[PDB]
Structures are given as structure tokens and as C-alpha cells.
Paper text:
The ribose-binding proteins are members of the periplasmic binding protein (PBP) superfamily whose members play roles in prokaryotic ABC transport, chemotaxis, and intercellular communication systems. The PBP fold consists of two domains each of which adopts a three-layered α/β/α sandwich motif. The two domains are linked by two or three β-strands that form a flexible hinge which permits the domains of the protein to bend towards each other in response to ligand binding at the interface between the two domains. Here we report the high-resolution X-ray crystallographic structure of a ribose binding protein (tteRBP) from the hyperthermophilic bacterium T. tengcongensis (optimal growth temp ~80°C).
The tteRBP crystal structure was solved to 1.9 Å resolution by molecular replacement using the ribose-bound form of ecRBP as the search model. The asymmetric unit contains 346 water molecules and two tteRBP molecules (residues 40–313) in essentially identical conformations (0.12 Å RMSD of backbone atoms) complexed with ribose. The tteRBP structure adopts the overall fold and topology that is characteristic of periplasmic ribose-binding proteins. The apparent thermal transition midpoint (appTm) of 102°C in the absence of GdCl was determined by linear extrapolation of a series of melting point determinations carried out at different GdCl concentrations. tteRBP is therefore significantly more stable than the mesophilic ecRBP (appTmvalue is 56°C). The appTm value of the ribose complex in the absence of GdCl is 114°C; the appTm value for ecRBP under equivalent conditions is 72°C. Analysis of main-chain and side-chain geometry of the aligned structures indicates there are few differences in the main-chain geometries of ecRBP and tteRBP (0.4 Å RMSD of 235/271 Cα positions and 0.65 Å RMSD of 270/271 Cα positions and distance between aligned Cα positions range from 0.03–3.1 Å over 270 Cα positions). The loops and turns in the binding pocket retain near-identical conformations. Polar amino acids, non-polar amino acids, waters, and the hydrogen-bonding interactions are identical in both tteRBP and ecRBP sugar-binding pockets. A bias is observed for a gain of polar and charged amino acids on the surface of tteRBP (net of twelve charged and three polar substitutions), while the opposite is observed for the tteRBP core, where there is a bias for the loss of polar amino acids (seven net substitutions). The comparative analysis presented here shows that the substitutions responsible for conferring thermal stability on tteRBP are encoded in side-chain identity and location (core, boundary or surface) which serves to alter surface polarity/charge, removal of unsatisfied core hydrogen bonds and increase in core/boundary side-chain hydrophobicity.
Numbering used by the authors: 2 to 275
Write the structure that this text describes.
Amino acid sequence: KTIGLVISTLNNPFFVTLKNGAEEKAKELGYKIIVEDSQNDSSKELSNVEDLIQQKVDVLLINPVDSDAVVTAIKEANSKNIPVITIDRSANGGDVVCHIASDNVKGGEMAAEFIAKALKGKGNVVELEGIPGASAARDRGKGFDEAIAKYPDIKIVAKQAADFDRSKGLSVMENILQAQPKIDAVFAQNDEMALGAIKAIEAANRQGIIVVGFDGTEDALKAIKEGKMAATIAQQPALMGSLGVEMADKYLKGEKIPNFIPAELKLITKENVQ
Ligand SMILES: O[C@@H]1[C@H](O)[C@H](O)CO[C@H]1O
């Protein structure tokens, strides 16, 4: 028996960890696993899924590139009676037997609360959004807005997408720095964007700025120890991958499973890094 793992991109350390979590548990339970990289492209994702259907995989674990666009691939999986579990990001359609992810609205709230307290409830905040087609991104923005709105002297002065990517985080932060001489904090919706923003800030010789990421990647934790990043909202990618395989196993054994499993989040600062 064989599991198909379709991941949005392997250019993000977060997803490399998720991949490794799935692989470790698959060995443990005696499953083969085929991991395929969608390269943030819904077309590559569909071709990846079709390859896996043709290899006769017994279950499909998918981390969608886009909430709507993924439904075609899921509905092809459905037609061939291959069970689908979504991981980290939700699908807006098709039959999905389980979804495993963080409470990303709560994660955005956590980031906002930290920033608002750290800034004594006053200042200019920049938000670097992730891929808009990812539930994770949308949810973090919603939670962040909901929490920061309670602090009227905090103004979100720029809100721009940087596609969960380090390079785009740099370039976007460059532009924002040029357009905004007063920035007191930055929330990036993932660590890769946060690291890119840091590079832009250090390049511009800005001081000065409390940078908060999302994920708890090794590079982020190192940035925090070095004092380049103030905090991150740590996720459990390896556990998400592990649970995905676990629930696949149970489902394949004829057992009913919950249809949603939340993965816990933890705020990480210098005080508790590591
Ligand atoms: O949860 C994940 C991670 O934050 C990753 O860095 C980007 O994609 C999101 O869905």
C-alpha cells in the first residue's frame, strides 16, 4: 500500500519538514510514499495528482495550491475512489475525509496581540500577506485585523502580498520601506517572507522594527536568537504530515475518523526559543 503526497512547494522549509513528518510515519506504519512538488502551480498540481492516480495510490494527501482550483484534482480523485485528506490548507469543494491544519485565525490573533503589547498599543504596522489562494493566508489576515482593530492607535500602513516567498518578501518590503518612513512593526504571514523583509530592512539601515513571522522554521528561530526577528508563531509541520498518514491508515482500515484535526500553535520569542 502506497500514499501520494502532493505539496504546494518544496522551496519552503516549512513544507520540507511536513514532507519529512509524513515520510517518517509512513515507514513506521509500513507504507510506501510518493511525494510530488506542485511548484505553487495548480497545473503542476493536477498533473501530479493524475500521475499518482495512475500509479494506483491508495490514499491522497494534498496541500492545495489554491482553495478553488484544487477541487478539480480532488474530484478526479473522488471519481477513481481514492480518499483525499487535505493538510495545512483547505479545499473549497470535492469530497475530503479529513482536514489537518493550524487554527490560522487564532495564529493571526496571536501575532497581533504580541505586536500591540510590544508597541504599547501605538504605532505603524506593515503586514506582508501570503498567497491569497491559501486558506492559511486569508485566515491569518482576518485574525490579525480582528485583534489589531481593538487598538485604535495602531495603524496598518501597508498590506501587500508577497506569496509566502523570501525573494518577493524582500522586494515588497523594499517598496514599502521607500513609501513609509515610519514603520514600527512588521507581521509576515510566514517566516520566509519575514526573513526577506529583514534583509530589506537591514539593507535600508532601518532600526527599529519589530518583525514577527509565522511557522517556527529553523531560519526564523536563528533570526530570533540573533535578535533580527522579535517573534514567530510556531506551527507543527512534521505533526501535520504525521497525522495525515495516521488518518489515512485508519480510514483505509474501515475506521471512521474526525473530519478536522487542529494542530496547535505556540508564540516563540527570545525568552522561550528553543
Ligand atoms: O502554513 C503554511 C506555512 O505558513 C508556509 O510557510 C506557507 O503556507 C502555509 O499554508
